[PDB]
Amino acid sequence: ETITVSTPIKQIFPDDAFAETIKDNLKKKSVTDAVTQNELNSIDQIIANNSDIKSVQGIQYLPNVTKLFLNGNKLTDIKPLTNLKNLGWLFLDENKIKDLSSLKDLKKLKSLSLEHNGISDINGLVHLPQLESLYLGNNKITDITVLSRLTKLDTLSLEDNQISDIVPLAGLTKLQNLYLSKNHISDLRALAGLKNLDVLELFSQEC
Ligand SMILES: [Ca+2]
Ligand SMILES: [Ca+2]
């Protein structure tokens, strides 16, 4: 939503680490400083990797965010991201996010990163058919059936998981970079129809 009157940053963003992130972004001197919606509208990029953030509550008030770097934090719930319709790049590596339902309406999202999140179920990704780059390395994924729906993918990382069947990737004609090392892959027939692969990693398969 939006704030109708001047309001302290700390009152909008509960998480102290995140409040500090917003403070620096807006070049304000303190999280106790009052901000307006006009100022919040100016935010289109949040760089907060390894910033000890546990909750991004308050981010709902930043309608123009297109890039969000939140790698290495303490995130679990990303429901506050639900209506950030302009989100194009979303990096959430090294967190503990498993509920991907909040991403279902992010129809402009082109790059998504969720490595090291302990994820096993990615069926929620079906709602991001426009996705171009997807990083899911170092998780506990076995079933990648849903990926057959992400036909726009040109970059896909599924390294260090528990995948055996890559048939779901057979129809992803746009794939240029495919990282599949450290899985349980034996059958590579699925790659017979891929014509644009430039980078392909398949080493260290445990069968
Ligand atoms: Ca607080
Ligand atoms: Ca600072």
Return d(Cα 28, Cα 35) in angstroms, integer.
9
28 alpha carbon to ligand 2 midpoint, in Å? 10
User: Is there a binding annotation on residue 129?
Assistant: no
User: Is there a binding annotation on residue 8?
Assistant: no
CB-based contact 183:161 (threshold 8 Å): yes
User: Is there a binding annotation on residue 159?
Assistant: no
Return d(Cα 12, Cα 46) in angstroms, integer.
16
71 alpha carbon to ligand 2 midpoint, in Å? 17
Q: How far is CA 72 from CA 46, 84, 174, in A?
A: 14, 21, 30
Q: Is the dihedral of CA 65, 70, 71, 77 positive or negative?
A: negative
Sequence length of the chain is 207
Q: How many domains does the chain divide into?
A: 1
Q: Which domain holds residue 113?
A: 1-207
CB-based contact 170:149 (threshold 8 Å): no
Q: Which residues, by Cβ under 5 Å, contact ligand 1, an ion?
A: 14, 16
Return d(Cα 56, Cα 196) in angstroms, integer.
38
Tokens of 160: 């260090």
Q: How far is CA 140 from CA 128, 162, 193, in A?
A: 20, 6, 27
Give residue 204's region: left, alpha or beta (phi > 0; psi -120 to 50).
left
Terminal alpha carbon distance of the chain = 50
Query: Rounded to the nearest 10 degrees, how much is the dihedral formed by the CA atoms of 185, 191, 196, 201?
Result: 20
30 alpha carbon to ligand 2 midpoint, in Å? 9
Return d(Cα 161, Cα 8) in angstroms, integer.
44
Q: How far is CA 25 from CA 21, 39, 41, 184, in A?
A: 6, 10, 12, 43
36: amino acid identity, one letter: T
Tokens of 177: 């970079």
Return the exposure string of 151-182: e unless at least 16 CB atoms fall within 10 Å of the residue's CB, then b. eebbbbbbbbbebeebebbeebebbebbbbbb
3-state secondary structure string across the chain: CCCCCCEEHHHHCCCHHHHHHHHHHCCCCCCCCEECHHHHHCCCEEECCCCCCCCCCCHHHCCCCCEEECCCCCCCCCHHHCCCCCCCEEECCCCCCCCCHHHCCCCCCCEEECCCCCCCCCHHHHHCCCCCEEECCCCCCCCCHHHHHCCCCCEEECCCCCCCCCHHHCCCCCCCEEECCCCCCCCCHHHCCCCCCCEEECCCCCC
Return the exposure string of 115-132: e unless at least 16 CB atoms fall within 10 Å of the residue's CB, then b. bbbebeebebbebbeebb
Q: Is the dihedral of CA 195, 164, 158, 149 positive or negative?
A: positive
| CATH assignment at residue 92 | 3.80.10.10
Ligand nearest the Cα atom of residue 51: 2
Q: How many CA atoms lie within 13 A of 4 on its CB side?
A: 0
Ligand nearest the Cα atom of residue 54: 1
Method: X-ray
20 alpha carbon to ligand 1 midpoint, in Å? 10
How big is the CA angle at 87 (ends 86 and 88), to the nearest 5 degrees? 110
Return d(Cα 49, Cα 41) in angstroms, integer.
22
Ligand nearest the Cα atom of residue 14: 1
Closest CA to 54 of 16, 100, 93, 98: 16
